[PDB]
Amino acid sequence: SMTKTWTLKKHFVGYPTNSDFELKTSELPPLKNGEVLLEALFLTVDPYMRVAAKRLKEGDTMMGQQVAKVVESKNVALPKGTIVLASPGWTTHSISDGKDLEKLLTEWPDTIPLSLALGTVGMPGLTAYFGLLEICGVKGGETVMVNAAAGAVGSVVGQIAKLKGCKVVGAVGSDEKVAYLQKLGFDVVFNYKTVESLEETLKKASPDGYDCYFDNVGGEFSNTVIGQMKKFGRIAICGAISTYNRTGPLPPGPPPEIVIYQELRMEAFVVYRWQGDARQKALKDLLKWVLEGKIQYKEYIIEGFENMPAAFMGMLKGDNLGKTIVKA
């Protein structure tokens, strides 16, 4: 059984380039007992891979999740044709013993793409759900600031915020994303790349300030938002994508006098903190809200495993509208 694999050939400096990756064709051993052979159907690329790749050694497989089908099975719990979520990395075929696999929701309907299991009704959507509902702790009526608002996490954060009864101000990197989020129902959406003054734009978007900040971006942008947080404002620190592809020193930290005077609470989190009953409940909620039309989705599907590095680089640079997914 053959497989293709994208490995890290050279550690990224700034943004990745194509020569930092190397495609390798490898032979897989026959299935041992209890194992299954998985064929990737859809693979995801996500911002955290830029950071996690710094702990790889050159020659290692790029990390990542995929929706796959069992093509050969020596495990009766996972017969041939079963669809699963698996994280073997950027590889077309992989062998698993079944412990590290997740079946899709039992009521997953024919009407929603399986690829949403890597997005809105998968790990990005769960990140939004717990970051907003538990870390920010929205009760309804808050003004929420969300950046990278057209990504899979941010778009879910903003739409959950709307259905919980919040005002949502979203920052995105292109005019195409501005129009998209306005159609989704965000109260204010703006292109942070072209606005004359981020501080002025945020003050006009909410003269009263912000109760909650769902922060995917970090850096100088968050320093500006911090200066417009209300007293006891809550910040959920989900990512710092503005720093992942940085070439020099990190930007200044936030102004402590404002942080202290406003008694801000800032908590970072990773989606894996939540498991079991909480996590199954959240996936069911996300699926229900999608079916009810309260959460709309959009995917940027790139065809061909050979284009995974390019999909990752375009995703990191904000070139793609919707969740970037690679179709095998």
Which residues are near its own copies by CB under 8 A?
51, 218, 237-240, 243-244, 249-257, 259-270, 273
Q: How many residues does the chain have?
A: 328
Among Cl ion, ligand MTX, its own copies, none, what does residue 15 contact (CB within 5–8 Å per kind)?
A: none
Q: What is the CA angle 291-294-298, rounded to 5?
A: 80
- From 26-34, 149-157, 179-187, 286-294, span contacting ligand MTX (CB under 6 A): 149-157
Gap between the Cα atoms of 216 and 20, Å rounded: 25
How far apart are the C-alpha atoms of 274 and 107, rounded to whole Å? 21
Q: How far is the CB of 271 from ligand MTX (least distance, A)?
A: 5
Return the one option of ligand MTX, Cl ion, its own copies, none that residue 315 interacts with (CB less than 5 to 8 A, by type): ligand MTX
151 annotated binding-site participant? yes
- Say if CB 129 and CB 281 are below 8 A apart: no
List of long-range contacts for 200-203, beta carbons under 8 Å, 24+ apart: 202/145, 202/169, 202/228, 203/228
Q: Is 160 in the site for ligand MTX (CB under 6 A)?
A: no
Q: Determine whether the annotation assigns residue 210 to a binding site.
A: no
75 marked ligand binding residue: no
- Build a one-symbol-per-residue string for 283-322: x at contacts with ligand MTX by CB under 6 A, - elsewhere: --------------------------------x----x--
Q: Which of residues 153, 181, 235, 259 is near ligand MTX by CB under 6 A?
A: 153
Structure tokens at 31: 């299935």
121 touches 286 (CB < 8 A) = yes
Q: In what helix (H) or strand (E) does residue 312 lie, and over which residues does it extend? A: helix 308-316
Judge whether 243 is annotated as a binding position.
yes
**Tokens 């996500």 correspond to what residue?**
46
- Output 210 or 297, the one with its CB closest to ligand MTX: 297
The two tokens of residue 284 are: 């069911």
The verdict on whether residue 177 carries a ligand-binding annotation is yes
323 binds ligand MTX (CB under 6 A): yes
Is 240 annotated to bind a ligand? Reply is yes
Closer by beta carbon to ligand MTX, 5 or else 216: 216
Query: Pairing state of beta strands 188-191 and 66-73?
Result: unpaired
Task: Examine residue 278 and tell whether it contacts ligand MTX (CB under 6 A).
Answer: no
**CA angle, corner 238, sides to 121 and 315, nearest 5?**
65
Helices 198-205, 219-226: axis angle to 10 degrees equals 40
Closest CB to its own copies among residues 179, 261: 261
Picked from Cl ion, its own copies, ligand MTX, none, the partner binding residue 2 (CB below 5 to 8 A depending on kind) is none
Q: Which amino acid, residue 100? A: D
Side-chain-side CA neighbours of residue 67 (13 Å):
20
The reply to whether 269 sits in an annotated binding site is: yes
Q: Is 123 in the site for ligand MTX (CB under 6 A)?
A: yes
Position 177 contacts ligand MTX (CB under 6 A): no
Q: Which is nearer to ligand MTX, 49 or 95 (CB)?
A: 49
Contact flags string 200-229 toward ligand MTX, x per CB under 6 A: ----------------x-------------
Q: Sort strands 66-73 and 36-44 into parallel, antiparallel or unpaired.
A: antiparallel
| 52 near ligand MTX, rule: CB under 6 A | yes
For residue 7, give Cα distances in angstroms to 39, 59, 245, 317: 18, 6, 19, 20
Residue 320, token pair as written in the block:
């793609």
Among 21, 42, 47, 147, binds ligand MTX (CB under 6 A): 47
Start-to-end CA span in the chain (Å): 16
| Residues at the site binding ligand MTX, with contacts judged by CB under 6 A | 46-48, 51-52, 65, 123-124, 127, 148, 151-154, 216, 239, 270-271, 315, 320, 323-324
Known binding positions for NADP(+):
151-154, 177, 192, 216, 238-244, 269-271, 320
